[PDB]
Design a protein around this ligand. Structure first.
Ligand SMILES: CC(=O)N[C@@H]1[C@@H](O)[C@@H](O)[C@@H](CO)O[C@H]1O
Ligand SMILES: CC(=O)N[C@@H]1[C@@H](O)[C@@H](O)[C@@H](CO)O[C@H]1O
Ligand SMILES: CC(=O)N[C@@H]1[C@@H](O)[C@@H](O)[C@@H](CO)O[C@H]1O
Ligand SMILES: CC(=O)N[C@@H]1[C@@H](O)[C@@H](O)[C@@H](CO)O[C@H]1O
Lengths: 361, 361, 361, 361
């Protein structure tokens, strides 16, 4: 089983014990680690943060004691701009420059691979996206055709039905990619203005979600049906939760909300909490397991958070093993308890370790 | 929380330890016990079996130590002839004689109420059935008018979407009935000529069943939607399994079958097994929990049976409690381990006791 | 001990069995293989031959089956032109561009380091050469400072006293280089217009040479005295001979000549023969061991050639081991009998294997 | 070519097999044999050993079967005293008497000529030596005027540059001498307190000897340069070796010593060893060929000896033939294996037959 794990370069800047650099990662935890993100600039792949070269260094250092570890560089992400990635993929010169720039940059900086994270190609870009992928694989085959270890090509794809239907030719791109990470989290499948979990496994209670699409099971089945081979599909599992401010005494699934949850001290983003933040929040909170969805939420005063814990990630790994998927993708290493000193069990990366042990069973 | 339990009269004729009579029944187990079934003969309510009047008393003796206990007599059943019942409830005199005949016969034989089990009112009968339930509740209010204790009225309704849509005016009859026993088992939800569980709680893997309706969650939600109040709805939990003969080595959900399953020694009905026969079957067998349905099946040799156990009935009780339903209905006392000698715990009614325990916590 | 061996890119064009491509090289033969030469173009390190990129890869493939093997790329050579290397190294901006370009180029194309072959810095360029080496070494230390395998830096240096005195600050460049390959061959030690061996180990007969300086032993000792550590000094051993056309019946050392030797069938360069050509020539030749110089010459008709054989390279290896040098350097693989079919042993790389054997003993 | 061999008269007194007398000598081995040493007493040439006259007889017996063998007697030696030969040679009366005394004594005792072994003239005796040689030769020309066979005049000379510069007018004495024997052994060219070979053919490793001039090639080249005809120069070759006692684990050339080598059983002279003694030593010893010097040393335990073997003496002959020298000189028959029972092969005079063979090839 593959265990693909994202590290985000902006986690370095978080205050205090929140600050995360690649020298804090367990080198035997993951089969693959992906660094996010890289810019594209003058149509060439390029660094993002001032100190990426150092941080690339720290990441690849982990391969010294662990030969099997693979590292990829993810290009794109949320702050990149769907627009900008569009302009580049659609134009024929721009695309060639970009593609031609990739292998030298990866080799120069110690990476085994590229992860395309265009979030997201629009309706207009479906063919461009297929082309980009096909030609990038072609370039990687050429570059290594004299005897080398060939560079890996992956992509992070939406788990949302709408985006999958409009943006991705699944059968075509699946043939050229080495794996697909499906982002089975951040589903927006609650009734407007109410609580719901952002990463249910199963739909659960039929009449308590507006549709059947907003869950891990549906999206995994859909992508399999659309022609992605089970053996190339990696199933995304979050180490963050999505939080809401409650607007009444109701704390169930479907309760009214007034908006996103109060920011965490360290991640400082409304509507999100790192698992290490949730471990703090849980002291004095009530935990409930949403029966049909197989995932927990916690509530304390006017705050509600839907997240994953050791029991839930085990259920998720059972699912992915039963479907013979290739493995699990973890977003993100820097949002697990990587200091091992918030979750009260002195265990670094409790969630990721949980996934790893369930893959072994 | 009501806990409505069905005792069947034909269960007296099973060999050896199979034989069951109202004497073997724990008086504290249930709140309501429902005797099934009664005839309608020449438009008056009648007995069925030769020794019904004895068994009535054996049953109504149990109320001696227990004044909280209620009993009800169910009239109808599968053998009745759905034809015959429709005739009776369409004709204006028939219905009048019938309704008039019930209250004396009930007080006489010691019953606290009637349970309607017309299986099933078809197309045409929707209004007849609505009226029958309306005028029967008219009679039971008139009968107890001199300060008696009003007779209870209830009905066993289908959990099948088709049958509910064609047969029941749930908004109307729910105002007249005291509770509704919704038969959330014997779904026909599997792909054709393949294995499936007959009483799943949730739909489960979205791509592994033809429809979203053949599960307990759907049925309960549907009825809540159609007008039935939560405080009048009692959720059916089976103490029996449905079995199949497999046709290949595949033993999963949706494995090819060739027909129903070898009959039990004591129940002697192909495709059925009492819980106590299942305990016999389990020794030697692989149990697997269906992940999204939250129910087990067992397979051994060319036999596959989907059944409910202590873990699974507690989940269903957690489900019914979370929806604030009236309580749980059990089909049937004579099919749980009533000896206490099969399931190796030396415990009478393991499944029914699991349901009681969970209801109180 | 190191065994550094040069492969020359232009050897690929030699007719017939002379043609040598990197895939003919024994992957277990040498510790370090150096590819010569790379261009510098627009102050950037660059390819020379149109197929360099294919040949780099056939070389680097040799590492798959033997990971210990190291590869370096040599920049410069005799066709480069000393005066064009001057301007690059002496302009501060050219030199930075160049130095900046090397590590990406090396990593992109699979090489473990750079070999400098400036042939040769004049008196004017001594300091420039020193500076070039210091800065170039600093860059490799920087590029690697986060946990990479650091890039090797080596230099092919002249064994000629006059060039060493004019061009090299030995003490300073020795601390920065990882090894020095001293080109202890092609000495111009013969009395003008007379036969002499181009790679004597010692001076031999005192009154039969012009100078005491044109011999391996002098050049080694001189570099040691000047500050090159033994542990960084690699001693060049030729797999080629230098040939003369005799002008009389005299056939000894110091016999009159009329010009360089007739070209070989395959190397096609007057005054030079590959070892495999020498094997052909030895058929009907007389060989003599030069008494003080520990090396052979052969003569046949009007031709005379001073070369190395298995015995003579063995002696050279004894010598370098007794001086505790870092190992042997071989110019060049493509001039050894790489085919194995010329020296009537059916044994590929006869000279280099002999060198290898003597280093291991 | 000439082959000039010394027998030493004091070799009779050595124990057992060590004992050597002229009857032990093959008569076909040498072209000249030189009996050493004779005395000068009361300014007349005398005998030295009590039995000299017998030994001279046995020696001269050898010419009975061999018409071509030539014998000479050698006045002087180390034990004569430089101080005393000076006084005989510097006084016009002394010297005239000596000269005149010489021919009759030589005719009387069977000798074909005289060999001068003044070891050695000082600065102050240079011109006296020139005058002795000139006058002695004038005498021998005059004594032969009655149609006799002219007596042979030869001289043994130092190979050391200092002695040559102080003592010898090579150009002048060369015309009067029939041959010069150059003593190209017993060189004092080890760094002080260290091992060195006493008879190297060439200088060898440039920085592993104090001086350029303690070797055979330099001595020969120097004499030629000072005006000795090649056709009169006989190059000395030793059959003994010189031995040290090591002071350390180091056994190489220039290793630390503590004093001379353990005396041999038969020679009893610290720091010397006959070849027959060396043949025993070799059993259990390591032999190394010194690359520069074309000569072996042997070490075993705390002992180290530099000697000449069959290989080394063949090379010394090659050198003398290439330089067109008159022939070889051997010191000495009694230090070679004259028994023929020490060196394994059952051959008498291994080293001297080696010389002879090489002179004939
Ligand atoms: C610096 C960076 O990460 N992003 C730049 C962005 O700032 C913008 O200027 C663009 C050109 O319009 O190039 C991008 O890569
Ligand atoms: C099973 C049973 O009790 N059936 C009776 C029987 O008398 C039957 O013949 C019918 C007459 O039409 O009436 C039913 O109530
Ligand atoms: C062999 C080679 O590639 N060398 C080029 C040469 O082609 C030429 O253009 C020169 C211009 O001054 O630059 C060199 O590097
Ligand atoms: C007898 C002999 O062999 N040697 C003597 C020596 O002993 C010494 O007496 C000298 C004159 O003082 O004359 C030498 O020839």
């Amino acid at each position: 089983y593959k265990l693909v794990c994202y590290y985000t370069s902006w986690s370095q800047y978080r205050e205090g014990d929140g600050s995360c650099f690649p020298d804090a990662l367990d080198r035997f935890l993951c089969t693959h680690i992906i660094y996010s993100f890289a810019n594209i600039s003058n149509d060439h792949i390029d660094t993002w943060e001032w100190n990426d070269v150092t941080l690339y260094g720290m990441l690849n250092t982990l391969k010294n004691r662990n030969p099997n570890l693979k590292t990829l560089l993810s290009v794109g992400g949320w702050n990149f701009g769907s627009q900008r990635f569009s302009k580049i993929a659609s134009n024929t010169q721009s695309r060639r420059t970009f593609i031609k720039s990739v292998p030298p940059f990866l080799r120069t900086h110690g990476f085994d691979g590229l992860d395309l994270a265009w979030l997201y190609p629009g309706r207009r870009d479906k063919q461009h996206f297929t082309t980009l992928i096909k030609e990038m694989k072609a370039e990687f085959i050429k570059e290594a055709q004299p005897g080398k270890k060939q560079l890996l090509l992956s992509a992070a794809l939406s788990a949302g039905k709408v985006t999958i239907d409009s943006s991705y030719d699944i059968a075509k791109i699946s043939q050229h990619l080495d794996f697909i990470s499906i982002m089975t989290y951040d589903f927006h499948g609650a009734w407007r203005g109410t609580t719901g979990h952002h990463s249910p496994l199963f739909r659960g209670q039929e009449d308590a979600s507006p549709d059947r699409f907003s869950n891990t099971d549906y999206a995994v089945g859909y992508m399999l049906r659309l022609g992605a081979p089970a053996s190339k599909l990696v199933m995304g599992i979050p180490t963050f939760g999505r939080s809401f401010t409650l607007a009444s005494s109701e704390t169930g699934v479907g309760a009214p909300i007034s908006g996103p949850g109060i920011p965490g001290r360290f991640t400082k983003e409304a509507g999100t909490l790192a698992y290490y933040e949730i471990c703090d929040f849980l002291r004095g909170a009530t935990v409930h397991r949403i029966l049909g969805q197989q995932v927990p939420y916690a509530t304390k005063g006017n705050q509600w958070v839907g997240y994953d814990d050791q029991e839930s990630v085990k259920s998720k790994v059972q699912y992915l093993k039963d479907r013979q998927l290739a493995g699990a993708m973890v977003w993100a290493l820097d949002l697990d308890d990587f200091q091992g000193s918030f979750c009260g069990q002195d265990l670094r990366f409790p969630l990721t370790n949980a996934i790893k042990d369930a893959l072994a069973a």
